[model samples]
Target: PTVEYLNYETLDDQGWDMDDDDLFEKAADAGLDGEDYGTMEVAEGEYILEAAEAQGYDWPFSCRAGACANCASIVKEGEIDMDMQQILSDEEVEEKDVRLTCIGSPAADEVKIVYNAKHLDYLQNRVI
Candidate 1:
């Protein structure tokens, strides 16, 4: 199966088809760990948190609306179309690193992100 970089080392084989609940559950079952961060571009539609519940990764999120920056993650790469943000500061957004994962969706076919873990720790920490 093709692996989509959902967050850090955690890749969702099903891509957008997986729902938040299933994503988290499968991650847990597979013994995956660390923060399950997802990268997506912004547009005018419903963006689902495909693996939130399956992975058991408790992101710093509240409301689940784009109103709060609680679910913010740094955008390591890619271009995203976004709208008005109430939580993230101007500098943060301009840095092109921070994004609200809850409401954000991908603008392109391929998006990459460093899930909430040390980039170099993949060898020692990856849960398969």
Candidate 2:
């Protein structure tokens, strides 16, 4: 039974449907409002970026194929299960705690990601 913990990796993400997802940052950042500046629905193993888009959040992304690391974000708070896509070296990931949102899924209930933040030696030009 304990071996189960070795196999797979593993959020309220309430319905939090966004009728105005385009206006997300604004409404969410206006005040304490309990509004989320941006919230990615934390599904265990689906691409957080794609799922966010499915939920209508206009987050940044270039290739949806996991080809480009354009859908990049930093996992500031929690864990994200990710692809072994060789876009960036392990050092890069370790350097800044980066993850590709396009192919990354949260491994924690609320893995906070800083969206589209740039890195000079890391994300500017990727192999994919």
Candidate 3:
């Protein structure tokens, strides 16, 4: 599968909280709505984080067993099915499109994600 991502830490406007209505606009300005992003190939049966690690990426993770939000990411497009996870709520997983990359694999052919989403306000309390 193809994965397109933007590292949240790369955003220019770090002050735009996720709860703000203008956050998407901020992301668009940062190129999330465009092709200005990193691309990677992930195997269907492999975890997203695992594939990233295999590619030599130092992407963040703490509990690789889906017990924490340290490996959190917000999906911009497409679905990612994950193993049972303890941290995220239904709204975060379904509505907000958040995923735990450590236990996730692409459920759609190609997916887009904002990795390093640990800083997003909605996810802050869960961060460890």
Best by lDDT: 3
Per-residue lDDT of 58-115 in model 3, one digit per residue for the tens? 5556465644664557677778877776666778766766777776788878777777
**Candidates in descending lDDT order:** 3, 2, 1
lDDT of each: 0.43, 0.48, 0.65
lDDT of 2 by residue, 10-125 (tens): 01123232223323433344432222244556457877766765655444454656456545454545666776666666666666656676667777785555454433335457
RMSD to true structure for each model, in Å: 10.9, 11.7, 5.3
Q: What lDDT, from 0 to 1, does candidate 2 have?
A: 0.48
Off by over 4 Å in 1: 1-58, 62-67, 81-83, 86-90, 94-96, 117-128
In terms of lDDT, the poorest run of 10 residues in model 1 is: 1-10
Over 4 Å off, model 2: 1-36, 62-66, 85-87, 118-128
Query: Model 2: which residue pairs collide?
Result: 10-107, 11-109
lDDT string, candidate 1, 67-100, tens digits: 4553444444443444565656667645535565
Q: TM-scores of all models?
A: 0.41, 0.52, 0.64
